[model samples]
Target: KCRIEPVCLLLHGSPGAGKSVATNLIGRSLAEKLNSSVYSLPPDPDHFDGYKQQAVVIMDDLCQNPDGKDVSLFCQMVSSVDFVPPMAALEEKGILFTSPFVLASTNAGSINAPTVSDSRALARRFHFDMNIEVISMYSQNGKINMPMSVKTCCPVNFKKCCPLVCGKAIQFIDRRTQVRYSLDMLVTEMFREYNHRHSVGTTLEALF
Candidate 1:
């Protein structure tokens, strides 16, 4: 099969935002979808021997790593065609690495030292920097410390459990749909509509 330049993604989010879950899902999906193996990048790429060509590679805790230069060099080479062992011996005559699909995750850590010396230069190495946030209404009130907390499945009556959200829900519905909706209601509606649209994936069109 033909190959393309590998992609390096950095995942960022707040605590309890499920960064690890997202990373595992992506790694799992990559293994199944692309028929590739998934492995985590070690601290020292030289002493490390867990590389697989075109494998789905993952790294995490961007700031916790000891050397920014090591991380930077790894990210840079992996995103390019000339990736190889990080030893200075291979610096001049390193073989072109097969470009593993790299997925790195962090939680509120500065990505500044993670990729490169300059923020803008990191753009060339990182294909995507995803800031994952779960938006919810639970924290809107001073009473709760939760977000994305769905308490019910009722499309119309779900908001009754937390009436504090009535104003925001009404305005949100007014802007999006005139029907009463909350996070769970909207999520339910989304799944329902998506099922209606794509779950029935068989070709039903008539071209005769």
Candidate 2:
């Protein structure tokens, strides 16, 4: 039960799932809306409080490698709300009462936090409370192979018709004007692997 319980969202997902992008976008939007900053913290020892509101903090890609499980610093981080203020701000070394706007893109693992091991840990020992929400993300769409039937629409030869006339039979995919589109079509029951390619090589490699 979250009575405005602090949200430490673990935006978890497989690679290329747009997790970090969403985290960055939200953090950036907040930075614009609230206008503060973003920090990569592993429990660092510096004060970040300021005249503006709390800065959006990002712990990007926690366990991206071997796909292991769990991190403790997170629970500990979300546990405490108050932060040490810059010594200059307070004449008597005041503690600034604040918590970072925590947004993580670490699909660190399934059940990455230890609090899940026990239900009592879920509830706050003191007055503070927390709720771990796993924000799962999948690719907004697949490899983005949009199908185009230029043969029916244009009926022109590959060499003269379109700017993107690849030597292959399939031609004319509107990747720009045709935005936010997803298509899957089969032509003559022979599946063609349609993964596209790109740019520059070394002049020597180009020459060879």
Candidate 3:
């Protein structure tokens, strides 16, 4: 069962900060873990492919020398989220049956952050959290895998042996918006296949 509510998020930082990379990590994790959907586009694409049960959309550099038109559209869409919880217990329900989680990243140094005015009234809808530094853990007294047999197994050329793992090296550049989004569609697929075969799980203690 998937959660009905989507967590709206923004990844804002200095010009050199790696917001896009972090966003990609989250996107890859979700898609692989849940077989969930992931989508990437400039401010407002034509359709709503990015809002499935666990949909994630990565908008790269929305605040970089921010354009008024793009900013306005982004604000309008975000501000318009009618946050109504599930009526399984609530008295009222909202149109966003499963509101899509949004991930927006931007460079704050070169461009002034979008103000409520630029976002218009829509800016009022989102609650912003300042994200800094990704925390990762390394365990010393754990049985980490040392001799994984799958290391030598290479995919046959064009065999589709693995799903379309978004190439980490490929990137997409939007000339009109001037925002570069990585072609990370392949990563999602790779992660899914890896998880399926590995029987990976999270635990602080080793189970006997």
Which prediction has the highest TM-score against the true structure?
1
Runs in model 2 deviating more than 4 A are 1-6, 42-54, 64-72, 80-97, 113-208
Model 1 lDDT tens row, 52-137: 45456677666643365665565555443354555454344444456446667776444555444556565555555555444354
After superposition on all C-alphas, the RMSD of every candidate to the true structure, in Å, is 11.6, 20.6, 15.0
lDDT of 1: 0.48
For candidate 3, write residues 1-208 as lDDT tens digits: 1222234445555443446655665565555455576666534433333333345656777655565655554554454344322333323333353424456676553234357465434333333333422211211233212122112222322223211112222233332344443224323333443344334352212243
* C-alpha local distance difference test of each model: 0.48, 0.35, 0.42
Worst 10 residues of 1 by lDDT: 167-176
Candidate number with greatest lDDT: 1
Deviation from native of the Cα of residue 179 in model 3, angstroms:
29
Task: Work out candidate 3's RMSD over C-alphas.
Answer: 15.0
TM-score of 2: 0.39
Give the CA lDDT, 0 to 100, for residue 69 in model 2: 21
